[PDB]
Design a protein that fits this description.
Number of domains: 1
Number of helices: 2
Bound molecules: heme C, phosphite ion
Helix content: 10-25%
CATH class: Mainly Alpha
Strand content: under 5%
CATH topology: Flavocytochrome C3, Chain A, domain 2
Radius of gyration: 14 Å
Distance between the termini: 35 Å
């Protein structure tokens, strides 16, 4: 099976690469700060990412314990109008 995104990161840097005291925060804010410490901000990302700057945390799409390395978030998790990744090109 492909590895979970959480475990892929834990192999590099442990659970504490994302979690303070290794325990999850109530709101995901700490974790989101950690994603950005290594990845930077949505403001500097591509056409699917940048429109979400100010609306979402990375984990809202890339749910690390539930999604695998390489797994593409699908837009139907939140938008009901049938848009897909190519919709930002049109
Ligand atoms: C960043 C890439 C992460 C790593 C590395 C680990 N976790 Fe995590 N975890 C992360 C997020 C963003 C969230 C919350 C959002 C979500 O999709 O759940 C979590 C959540 C947990 C939880 C709560 C689980 C739940 O209530 O469903 C636990 C107990 C947790 N994480 C533990 C954990 C451990 C032990 C890790 C090292 C093996 C670990 N996480 C890595 C982000 C990341
Ligand atoms: C630094 C300590 C990091 C933290 C905190 C988070 N990420 Fe990360 N991520 C990091 C690196 C160096 C890499 C590339 C590693 C490699 O060997 O390729 C990544 C990769 C991802 C990926 C892509 C996985 C793939 O498909 O190959 C995603 C989607 C990703 N990271 C998301 C992510 C999120 C949502 C985080 C916070 C919850 C997060 N990362 C934390 C370094 C670090
Ligand atoms: C949902 C609106 C998303 C949010 C919020 C974030 N990401 Fe994302 N990411 C998303 C999609 C749909 C895709 C796939 C794009 C495609 O069609 O290929 C991605 C891809 C990444 C990747 C690349 C993974 C790879 O294949 O190499 C990385 C590294 C990644 N996303 C990281 C990332 C981070 C760090 C975010 C918060 C700053 C973040 N994403 C938010 C959808 C969404
Ligand atoms: C929930 C985790 C989401 C997923 C998955 C995707 N999007 Fe999203 N998107 C989301 C929110 C909460 C918002 C803000 C909406 C608001 O009313 O402020 C957005 C916004 C966009 C936008 C910008 C506004 C718009 O023109 O609709 C675009 C272009 C957009 N989203 C596209 C999009 C695509 C193509 C996705 C799949 C790759 C996608 N979103 C996933 C929440 C979520
Ligand atoms: O190798 P394990 O993190 O799936």
């Amino acid at each position: 099976e492909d590895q979970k995104l959480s475990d892929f990161h834990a192999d590099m840097g442990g659970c504490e690469s994302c979690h303070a005291d290794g325990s999850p925060s109530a709101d995901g804010a700490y974790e989101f700060e950690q994603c950005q410490s290594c990845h930077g901000s949505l403001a500097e990302m591509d056409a699917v990412h940048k429109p979400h700057d100010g609306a979402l945390m990375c984990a809202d799409c890339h749910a690390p314990h539930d999604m695998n390395v390489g797994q593409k978030p699908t837009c139907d998790s939140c938008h009901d109008d049938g848009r897909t990744s190519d919709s930002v090109l049109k």
